[PDB]
Design a protein around this ligand. Structure first.
Ligand code: ATP
Ligand code: ATP
Ligand code: ATP
Ligand code: CA
Ligand code: CA
Ligand code: CA
Ligand code: CA
Ligand code: CA
Ligand code: CA
Ligand code: CA
Lengths: 310, 310, 310
């Protein structure tokens, strides 16, 4: 996995600058490697020569050069894909949700954008042979709609200890945009000690629609949103985890996702959800760089997300 | 093609200054010919007399004088044009994408700005008689949206060995502006050994919107962007390759490309992409010094970019 | 026209100093007459007495005294004006572009600042009775956007041999500021043998925005720009040709031309270009010592610049 920043000590760097970088939010050598010189210079206790020697030492451990696409293809052959509990949903995703990208699911209310996250938070702990990811699950909430009862219900479905499921899930509720951005630093800190395999944000844009209610604040809020998305992308690239976010929909004068072009460009795989009939739902791939546009049917049962049991 | 800097040895120059220039990033005699005296003086181990004698010797091999436009027209008669796989798209471009300039394609998300690059990366390896370029393809990524599966799918369309396609493509993912600029030096180094025919950057402005988020950093970031564009122009002029870049779009208070006047002036051919109906797309020439404004229709099929199969 | 420097031999000057002046860039007696003593002294093989006798002999052939403004008015009655192909554009310019001054056209991208030069390069070869200038055209390029196809298209419009048009046009592409200044010496050399009637630079400031990227280099680059502008002014005064340059625009925190006060003061007639609707464009006189501020409409057709065919 990720090399702890403790190694940077034996490269010829004193232990003082190591913790000076620690307070800045960096905890791994890869995290420091990907950061340009500007943020390192921004840190109060680092000179230009210090930043240059740090970057030079860090670049040795992490390769940053050109490679043949055959090696990249072989590396992509071992991406871990998490199953969603529904065979038709998994066939649409060609196996499941990839680890190392941003996946966004949006749609009308009552379409169960939260039950997907609830089911994933538990199916991600399954062994790899069964389609899981063998790791803890991290949940960030902004609506207060987190219910452990669904977690227990879907844990009993796969035959797992209910107590051991509620012990590998970290929960924290945000209250504003600032706290939402601040929680990512603590997430990066805790991802180094243990191993995580899924990051869930619900909802990524439920706060930005209200805090910046003024007219002239649109350009002021989309910049902050871009910073948040880049932080999530850095976390995905560093620890190699899967990030899933939920987005609201705003009707247009038939439904258009809210967030502007920033979230559309940043996101790689986007799923459109609309209600079917009864408890059935319809999932359609809205945007993806490798999958074609299609539709799938799934139902919300008492044991989490399952196939359309008619 | 380009004359290796090894020849500059027999002009009356010692082998020490040759590698001193090599560390600076110069690898061909043409590259040294186009560089003014200021950068040569900037190099630590070169005196003013050394720079003057180097420029005087280099100017002999590379012509730098006035010529009749008839010779230039005859030279332009042999520009290599790469086909895009769609006949209607090729008719709009009057044959294909020229080699020796900067081509920029931009538009809303999901409009397939990346599938064009994926198709070009493979069609550029076709024999010239079939519309290819007979050369390797170089891919620089900033979004992590590189998928070899599309490359294999579009390679099987033209009847080519899938393994031999993924072996003539160099892939490298950038993480910040500094790394994006630094990768060009390695690209220039590797263009001398083998032969390349296409340079792809995706995306050229996906990083600059976030790194320089401060208000007073606009003039600080557009200068760096101008340096990057001039480096790309120098690469295009030196090795005679084709450079294609992808640009995001920002809505205006109906879509305006992001990048400012610098990218607009630097770019020669600009393509505007918007979604048609279903899997069809609409391509419109936005800016070009020789082609008139028009529209074309193409569709994204399972075998890459193809004609509108209705 | 201009008296060759060969005459200076029969004034009492040996043939050695004549070619010593030739290597310095002087080729006509008028060119030597306008140069102060400082540059002549700067030449290695000339003494103070030599420079004084050269200036004294040269001043006899070229008048340098006061004259009545009636003679100047009668001389101005025979200025050659080149038509731009559009009647509304010509009415704005009161006949066309004068010969013996610097004309600058600037504006947003895609406004066709290069198509004006392409059309002029061909309309300048027309007979005087038809509004031409009866002379060759000289083109200096810095963007690589020179296309002979537009030249042929606009040559067929006026009924001229396509081959004979591409044979009276000299093309040369600059790569840095130093080469841009150096090409003027060769232009001055070749203007003596044949007859030229138009000098085109595109773009005059496309290189200076990047080469001198440092903060403290602003005063270092504007001096060089002033030298370049004075060289162009000397060429215009000596051979009596028309000089046209193209300038980029930089947005201000609605568009401001780039170049500073030097280019504004040096230029005499400045044209502001902005896009109309469709293929139409709007031309506005920005600065001129004799024409009032007004607006005109023209369109970019398939046969070069023409009137607004609605
Ligand atoms: N225990 C349960 N058993 C069966 N169906 C349930 C259960 N709990 C909730 N549901 C159903 O799931 C749906 C609610 O899902 P959810 O709250 O995730 O929707 P949502 O669209 O993501 O919500 P919002 O956007 O309002 O936060 C409703 O149709 C509800 O009837
Ligand atoms: N294998 C495939 N077969 C058919 N269509 C596909 C396939 N893979 C992706 N698509 C379609 O191509 C489009 C996605 O293209 P692409 O990712 O290049 O878009 P983009 O606008 O360049 O993206 P962005 O700006 O978000 O990076 C979608 O319409 C998607 O349905
Ligand atoms: N053959 C043609 N027929 C008709 N219109 C054309 C033709 N070639 C180019 N155009 C149009 O002319 C315009 C491009 O002109 P041009 O390249 O001179 O612009 P510019 O503003 O000077 O460019 P830049 O500053 O980017 O160098 C575009 O509107 C393009 O559609
Ligand atoms: Ca609700
Ligand atoms: Ca919810
Ligand atoms: Ca996307
Ligand atoms: Ca993409
Ligand atoms: Ca352009
Ligand atoms: Ca141009
Ligand atoms: Ca003026």
């Amino acid at each position: 996995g990720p090399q702890p920043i403790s190694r940077l000590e034996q490269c010829g760097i004193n232990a003082n600058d190591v913790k000076k970088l620690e307070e800045a939010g960096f905890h791994t050598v890869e995290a420091v490697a990907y950061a340009p010189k500007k943020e390192l210079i921004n840190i109060k206790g680092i000179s230009e020569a210090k930043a240059d020697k740090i970057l030079a030492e860090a670049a040795k451990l992490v390769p940053m050069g050109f490679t043949t696409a055959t090696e990249f293809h072989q590396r992509r052959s071992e991406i871990i894909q998490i199953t969603t509990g529904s065979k038709e949903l998994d066939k649409l995703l060609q196996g499941g949700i990839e680890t190392g990208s941003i996946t966004e699911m949006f749609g009308e209310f009552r379409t169960g954008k939260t039950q997907i996250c609830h089911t994933l938070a538990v199916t991600c702990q399954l062994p790899i042979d069964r389609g899981g990811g063998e790791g803890k699950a991290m949940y960030i909430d902004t609506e207060g709609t987190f219910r452990p009862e669904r977690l227990l219900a879907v844990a009993e479905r796969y035959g797992l200890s209910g107590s051991d499921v509620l012990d590998n899930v970290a929960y924290a509720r945000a209250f504003n945009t600032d706290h939402q951005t601040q929680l990512l630093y603590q997430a990066s800190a805790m991802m180094v000690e243990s191993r995580y395999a899924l990051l869930i944000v619900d909802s990524a844009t439920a706060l930005y629609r209200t805090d910046y209610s003024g007219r002239g604040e649109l350009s002021a809020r989309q910049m902050h949103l871009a910073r948040f998305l880049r932080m999530l992308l850095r976390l995905a690239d560093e620890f190699g985890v899967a990030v899933v976010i939920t987005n609201q929909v705003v009707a247009q004068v038939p439904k258009k996702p809210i967030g502007g072009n920033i979230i559309a460009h940043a996101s790689t795989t986007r799923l459109y959800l609309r209600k079917g009939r009864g408890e059935t739902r319809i999932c359609k791939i809205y945007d993806s760089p490798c999958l074609p546009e299609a539709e799938a049917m799934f139902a919300i049962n008492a044991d989490g997300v399952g196939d359309a049991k008619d």
